[PDB]
From Swiss-Prot:
Main subcellular location: cytoplasm
Gene Ontology terms: cellular component: cytoplasm
The name this protein goes by in its record: Ribosome-recycling factor
Positions of region (Disordered): 143-163
Places the protein is found: Cytoplasm
HAMAP family noted in UniProt: RRF (MF_00040)
The keyword Cytoplasm is assigned to this record: yes
CDD domains reported for this sequence: RRF (cd00520)
Family: Belongs to the RRF family.
Source organism per UniProt: Mycobacterium tuberculosis (strain CDC 1551 / Oshkosh)
Keywords of this entry: Cytoplasm, Protein biosynthesis
GO molecular function, one term: ribosomal large subunit binding
Length: 184
């Protein structure tokens, strides 16, 4: 019973952290390195997130400054940025890449709100399946008499509480990003 419950809880916390990260890939006012992470180049034959090939600095809310770890990667990196769906036109200063981030149109804003909610759905579905797996194990344990009925019943209640707490937390994360997106 313990194995099942503890692992489920850890997996759920991970899924919530994955959700956190995933949400951070959403273009927004208030720039951050996260929204550049799904931007890749061809790094010696392999598609590589540019967040791994450069340090990203965010001085102002709508100003990002990027420094390639290898100078000769600058052009490709900057090309991927401009070619990306962030809707930005980067500039170059010989060494660094400065990115001015325009205000999002209201149309694009609700488009991004929709992405945020889809990411939340994926994350909540994942947390529910983590629960299903642990619950079925609890069920197997009761059926095979490997633990007492009261004992398994208490574990079920606890598992539902943990599941619900993390679903709610995903919901909050989404509502927060939704807010960020309609803030500017």
């Amino acid at each position: 019973i313990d194995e099942a419950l503890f692992d489920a809880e850890e997996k759920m916390e991970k899924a919530v952290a994955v959700a956190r990260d995933d949400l951070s890939t959403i273009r927004t006012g208030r720039a951050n390195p996260g929204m550049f992470s799904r931007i890749t180049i061809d790094y010696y034959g392999a598609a590589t997130p540019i967040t791994q090939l450069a340090s990203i600095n965010v001085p102002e809310a709508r100003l990002v400054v990027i420094k390639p770890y290898e100078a000769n990667q600058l052009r490709a990196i900057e090309t991927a940025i401009r070619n990306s769906d962030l809707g930005v036109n980067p500039t170059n200063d010989g060494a660094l890449i400065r990115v001015a981030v325009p205000q999002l149109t209201e149309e694009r804003r609700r488009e991004l709100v929709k992405q945020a909610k889809h990411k939340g759905e994926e994350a909540k579905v994942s947390v529910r399946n983590i629960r299903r797996k642990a619950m079925e194990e609890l069920h197997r344990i009761r059926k095979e008499g490997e633990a007492g009925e009261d004992e398994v019943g208490r574990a079920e209640k606890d598992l539902d509480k943990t599941t619900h707490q993390y679903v709610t937390q995903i919901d909050e994360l989404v509502k927060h990003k939704e807010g960020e997106l309609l803030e500017v």
